[PDB]
């Protein structure tokens, strides 16, 4: 379950920090991952349209924080940093050091400073299954020969032929008496069959 994914852009040098139990600058001040962070991580390049005219300052990051980030914590906070004992009243004095200095996405550098179309697949588990899963390739059918079959949960082996028995909009199963499964309307053609 929990296919919460994020769609954002990350500079090329800070890429590996999206990792289970990693530190750095993003993983210290911008985006924290917990221990045992399994799943997947994927990034690829978003070079040549992530450069607005002379300095891509639409896109920010927090450069300073008092203490450690909690995992899964979004730092939307206008609470700027304080270094010394004199608190900042908005006027940039000597110990403010405004943490939201922005991304330097000006790709005139090498490959290490490039904007990348990154995603962070964050996977965890709660109590409700049958979430996002995979389309398991949906093979063909066969008739009039004994054959193994696996259907959507139930399975068996036999020959598949036509039928006279009828269904309703809800059935996925069929047995004549005493758990002897014999009837499947197929999940693709929606056509009723027998299992001899």
């Amino acid at each position: 379950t929990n296919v919460y994914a994020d769609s954002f852009v990350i500079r090329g040098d800070e890429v590996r920090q999206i990792a289970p139990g990693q530190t750095g600058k993003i993983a210290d001040y911008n985006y924290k991952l917990p221990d045992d962070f399994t799943g997947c991580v994927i990034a690829w390049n978003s070079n040549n349209l992530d450069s607005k005219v002379g300095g891509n300052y639409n896109y920010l990051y927090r450069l300073f924080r008092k203490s450690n980030l909690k995992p899964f914590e979004r730092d939307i906070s206008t609470e700027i940093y304080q270094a010394g004992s004199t608190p900042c009243n908005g006027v940039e004095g000597f110990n403010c050091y405004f943490p939201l200095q922005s991304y330097g996405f000006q790709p005139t550098n090498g490959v290490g400073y490039q904007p990348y179309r990154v995603v962070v697949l964050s996977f965890e588990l709660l109590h409700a299954p049958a979430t996002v899963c995979g389309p398991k390739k949906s093979t063909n059918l066969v008739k009039n020969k004994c054959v193994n079959f696996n259907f959507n949960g139930l399975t068996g082996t036999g020959v598949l032929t036509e039928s006279n028995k009828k269904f309703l909009p809800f059935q996925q199963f069929g047995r004549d008496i005493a758990d002897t499964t014999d009837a499947v309307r197929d999940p693709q053609t929606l056509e009723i069959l027998d299992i001899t």
Partner: antibody
Amino acid sequence: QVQLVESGGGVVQPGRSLRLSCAASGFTFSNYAIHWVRQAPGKGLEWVAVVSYDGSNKYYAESVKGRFTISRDNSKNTLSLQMISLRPEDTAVYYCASVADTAMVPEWYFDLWGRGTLVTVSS
Amino acid sequence: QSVLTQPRSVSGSPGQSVTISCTGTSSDVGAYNYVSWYQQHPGKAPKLMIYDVSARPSGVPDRFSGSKSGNTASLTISGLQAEDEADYYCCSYAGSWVFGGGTKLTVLS
């Protein structure tokens, strides 16, 4: 339609000044750099200038510095090119050169062109 | 250096392939990978055909192709059509935009 329409061309005398411009439509002009690339009639291509949205970063060519001044207005999606101390080698068809949105092409390359206007510095 | 070295004209039979050099310097061509190719019809604006020597933008046919080794780019147009007959320009950006000398492709008819 992504579209760039030059303005400010004409026929001027050497020693005088002129101001060109270019209006943008069809694309968010505040997110991509526009340039000036000049071409004399029947000759090669020659870049002039570039302006940033904050108005701080501007780069000029070697035959450009000290005379030509580019600026832009992100709100009106137009720009300006203030030009003083005009010489007859500056006689060229002037193109406001930017990039459209649909391309992966960045702003330092040259995809979205203008139709051009003629500036003649002659006595 | 100041102007990128190109052949002044390249003559080719229609349907064939031509190779047009863009000779620059190490501070112009071999420094980065940012070399362009520009087709300019007479009486019209230029038009982009090649970025980053390997690949092509949208709308550009696959007849346009490039190759770069060292300090010389090489635009290769296979299958010459009569609509390719125009002026050709290569440009590089390491710190500044340096254009080429100009190349008039002549489609022999």
